């Protein structure tokens, strides 16, 4: 239940997600903090029966960077865990793969990390 | 879709996926070929209008490792691209995050790569 | 050299490095509290003539986790860039590979990130 | 020592390394099939007392992509393990960080993998 809702990364990106009872993640990712042409479908999965020993809840999701307005020919996956409580966060690593020719495939995939919180960053 | 169908990685895993018209990926991932207790839901996204310059098709998907037989409290995301043709492949990089305590979060995420082909490996 | 000297990550590790004139990094990495038994040799390379247009200085280094007190049969590489100024930092992503059997090689490599600053975290 | 010597990746890059008695890696990396302009210093570390249970030998090294001829303002770290025997290999994953502005730091780091063998590929 703690996953469903709006999350903000450290750079101002926004995503809104619904965590389904059986493990589905569905929602929208906005690469800005207020822009229509910047909204993309996201889908993912999470552990719907996490451990109760204080461990985080494992999850992942994907955004393909095509919407009705733009197509970057690329897709980002986020892999991480949800941690609940007063300082709730989703801590993630991500991979962003661009469609490339075979010659350029070696440089097709960027890697980074995002920390999502329930409140916007300053 | 050249994407819709069954794919095998180089280690004995398989997945079956349907690529929807507007960019959905839906299917099942089987970590051990010939073992239905190792089948898990997969969901993801792909570029439904890739570039016309011979570039690959960017995609990503997630598997949370919970089914009726197992809960590993973990999730893997695969990020990559599909290349069509006689030697069709999905070339990926993946991130496997386990739910952990805060103290153990530094070692929560494994990284690797998978190459999927339409035919089983050796 | 803005790189030469002592750096602290976000979690209580320290390293001291000398940046040589032509691009060598040499020094010691201490994973712990100020625990001498957690000190390890580090070696790496950096760009000794970075672009002077506000770009960071690319660098990388390796620690093999063997010293006189410990052998974890593993090694971490950090890849990142140095950013100078009042809020100087070395922003990195790392890969930690453990020696494994072939059967376990798929889970041999952890991935994460470290931000190093010239002052200790709170 | 089985690490010392010449290794070839899957794409026609070459490196020559000396594994020192107490864990040093020193050598040269050539990204091409031949050419002094494409040769760069490498330095790293390896586990000089690996397990004897059939496990690989953990290692890592860095190449900063500056030599007397070229400067790409970037550096690659390889993290992996050496496996000896009739099919000796060094199995790695790598991170390539480019110096960037702060605005572009999110896309500073590429990730991939290399498999090195003692004999050239195709």
Q: What φ, ψ does residue D33 adopt, rounded to 5°?
A: -80, -20
Up-side HSE of residue A111: CA atoms within 13 Å toward CB? Answer: 31
d(CA B21, CA B42): 17
Residues forming a β-bridge with D95: D77, D111
Residue D112 DSSP SS3: strand
Q: Which among A95, A11, A28, A96 is positioned nearest to A68, based on CA atoms?
A: A28
Cα dihedral value C47, C52, C54, C57, nearest 10: 10
Chain B contact probe: residue of A79, A83, A85 with most B CBs at under 10 A: A79
Q: How far is A102 from chain C (nearest CA, A)?
A: 25
Up-side HSE of residue A120: CA atoms within 13 Å toward CB? Answer: 7
d(CA D120, CA D122): 7
List of residues 6+ apart from C40 with CB closer than 8 A:
C28, C29, C30, C31, C63, C64, C65, C66, C67
Q: How far is D109 from chain C (nearest CA, A)?
A: 8
Q: Which among D8, D6, D32 is positioned nearest to D17, based on CA atoms?
A: D6
CATH number at residue C4: 2.40.128.30
CB A57 within 8 A of CB A81: yes
Residues of A in contact with D110 (CB under 8 A): 107, 109-111
Instruction: Please name the residue of chain A whose CA is at the shortest distance from the CA of residue D98.
Output: A110
Plot region of D86 (φ>0 → left; ψ -120 to 50 → alpha; else → beta): alpha
Residues of C in contact with D101 (CB under 8 A): 53-56
Up-side HSE of residue A71: CA atoms within 13 Å toward CB? Answer: 15
List of residues 6+ apart from A9 with CB closer than 8 A:
A114, A115, A116, A121
d(CA D30, CA D10): 13
Place of tokens 């249970």: D53
CB C18 within 8 A of CB C3: no
Place of tokens 């999470």: A46
Chain D interface, Cβ < 8 Å to B: 93, 111-113
CB contact under 8 A, A79 and B109: yes
CA D117 to chain centre: 12
CB D26 within 8 A of CB D112: no
Q: Is A61 annotated as a binding residue?
A: no
Q: How far is A117 from chain C (nearest CA, A)?
A: 18
d(CA A77, CA A96): 7
Centre a 10 Å sphere on the Cβ of residue D22 and count the other Cβ atoms it contains.
12
Up-side HSE of residue D56: CA atoms within 13 Å toward CB? Answer: 31
Structure's resolution in angstroms: 1.8
CA distances from C42 to B18, C25, C63 (A): 48, 8, 5
d(CA C64, CA C72): 9
Range of the domain at D38: 1-122
Residues of A in contact with C111 (CB under 8 A): 93, 111
Name the domain count of chain B: 1
For A71-110, b/e burial (b = at least 16 CB within 10 A) is bbbbbbbbbbbbbeeeebbbbbbbbbbbbbeeeebeebbb
Centre a 10 Å sphere on the Cβ of residue C64 and count the other Cβ atoms it contains.
28
- β strands within B1-122, DSSP E: 5-8, 14-19, 24-30, 39-46, 57-66, 71-83, 89-98, 109-117
CA distances from C55 to A33, C82, D31 (A): 26, 9, 24
Experimental method: X-ray
d(CA A56, CA B100): 5
Chain A interface, Cβ < 8 Å to D: 11, 95-96, 106-107, 109-112
Residues of A in contact with C94 (CB under 8 A): none
CB B43 within 8 A of CB A24: yes
Q: Which among B61, C6, D5, B104 is positioned nearest to A53, based on CA atoms?
A: B104
Q: Is B52 exposed, middle or buried (0-12, 13-18, 19+ CB in 10 A)?
A: exposed
CB contact under 8 A, B95 and C111: yes
CB B63 within 8 A of CB B85: no
Residue D107 DSSP SS3: helix
Chain D contact probe: residue of A10, A72, A74, A106 with most D CBs at under 10 A: A106
d(CA C40, CA C65): 7
Kindly state the helix (H) or strand (E) to which residue D89 belongs, with its residue range.
Answer: strand D89-98
Residue C105 DSSP SS3: helix
Kindly state the helix (H) or strand (E) to which residue C66 belongs, with its residue range.
Answer: strand C57-66
CB C23 within 8 A of CB D41: yes
Pairing mode of beta strands D89-98, B57-66: unpaired
CB contact under 8 A, C102 and D93: no
Residue D103 DSSP SS3: helix
Structure tokens at B15: 């997945």
């Amino acid at each position: 239940a703690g996953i469903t809702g709006t999350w903000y990364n450290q750079l101002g990106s926004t995503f809104i997600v619904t965590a389904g009872a059986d493990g589905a993640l569905t929602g929208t990712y906005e690469s800005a903090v207020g822009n229509a042409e910047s909204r993309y479908v996201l889908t993912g999965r999470y552990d719907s029966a996490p451990a109760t020993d204080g461990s985080g809840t494992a999850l992942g999701w994907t955004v393909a960077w095509k919407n009705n307005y733009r197509n970057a020919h690329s897709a980002t996956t986020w892999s991480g865990q949800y941690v609940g409580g007063a300082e709730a966060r989703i801590n993630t690593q991500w991979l962003l793969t661009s469609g490339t020719t075979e010659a350029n495939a070696w440089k097709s995939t960027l890697v980074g990390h995002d920390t999502f919180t329930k409140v916007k960053p300053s």
